[PDB]
Design a protein around this ligand. Structure first.
Ligand SMILES: [Zn+2]
Lengths: 82, 162
């Protein structure tokens, strides 16, 4: 009952295997580690689906109604320089 | 495969320097910092910069100065765009009102988030022509620290072509 999620971070995909009872934040941590995206910590990133909706990171993966071949975009909440 | 961390040489088109300079100079005329991004294709230990992106951005006055902020909607747009185009984000570039360095804010909120990415800081609102020996450059390590790349190492790394 594992679910395959392609997570895209700065344009780079990583496939993360997920179980239905895992919150989405579990996949966030894994995708950032897999893609070496470290300059801001995991809580500073958020998920959007292909339709562009912001996803609740605390919701269980099985509750979204993903199809087996889902792509999600994981992007920063904010970028600042000065 | 070869991580971005292991890039040793970078091809930087002069046109991509010009696009950065024009943006930084333009907003600098209003006393504001600007931000630009270099994207391209990684060829293992070489990186070819293909384009400059000027992200949608806002300019806000802080207690000790000015900052440039990129909103969430634009960071999402950039992610999707890089994915569709098969491009990689190598570098961010921003300007300072005076001397160039990486501030504590710069250290904490970078857009170029991958181990091995570069963050270049252009002094004096980019008033003078861009010069790799005069910028302050930093590279992100595996423990999320932005460490200075000395000028001599930066010029060995990056070659500007025409
Ligand atoms: Zn700065």
């Amino acid at each position: 009952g594992k679910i395959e999620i392609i997570v895209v971070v700065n344009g780079q995909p990583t496939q993360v295997e997920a179980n239905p009872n895992q919150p989405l934040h579990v996949v966030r941590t894994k995708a950032l580690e897999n893609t070496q995206n470290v300059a801001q910590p995991p809580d500073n990133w958020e998920f959007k689906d292909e339709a562009g909706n912001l996803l609740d990171v605390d919701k269980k993966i099985g509750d979204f109604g993903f199809a087996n071949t889902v792509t999600l975009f994981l992007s920063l909440k904010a970028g600042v320089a000065g | 495969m070869t991580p971005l961390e292991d890039v040793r040489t970078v091809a930087l088109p002069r046109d991509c320097v010009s696009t950065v300079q024009a943006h930084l100079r333009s907003v600098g005329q209003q006393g504001h910092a600007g931000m630009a991004l270099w994207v391209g294709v990684q060829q293992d230990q070489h990186f070819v910069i293909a384009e400059t992106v000027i992200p949608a951005q806002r300019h806000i006055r802080t207690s000790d100065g000015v900052c440039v902020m990129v909103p969430a909607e634009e960071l999402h747009r950039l992610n999707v765009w890089l994915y569709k185009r098969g491009l990689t984000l190598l570098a961010q570039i921003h300007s300072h009102p005076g001397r160039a360095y990486h501030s504590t804010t710069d250290d904490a909120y970078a857009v170029a988030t991958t181990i091995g990415c570069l963050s270049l800081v252009v002094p004096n609102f980019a008033r003078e022509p861009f010069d790799l020996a005069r910028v302050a450059a930093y590279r992100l390590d595996a423990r999320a620290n932005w460490n200075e790349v000395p000028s001599a190492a930066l010029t060995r790394m990056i070659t500007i072509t025409s």
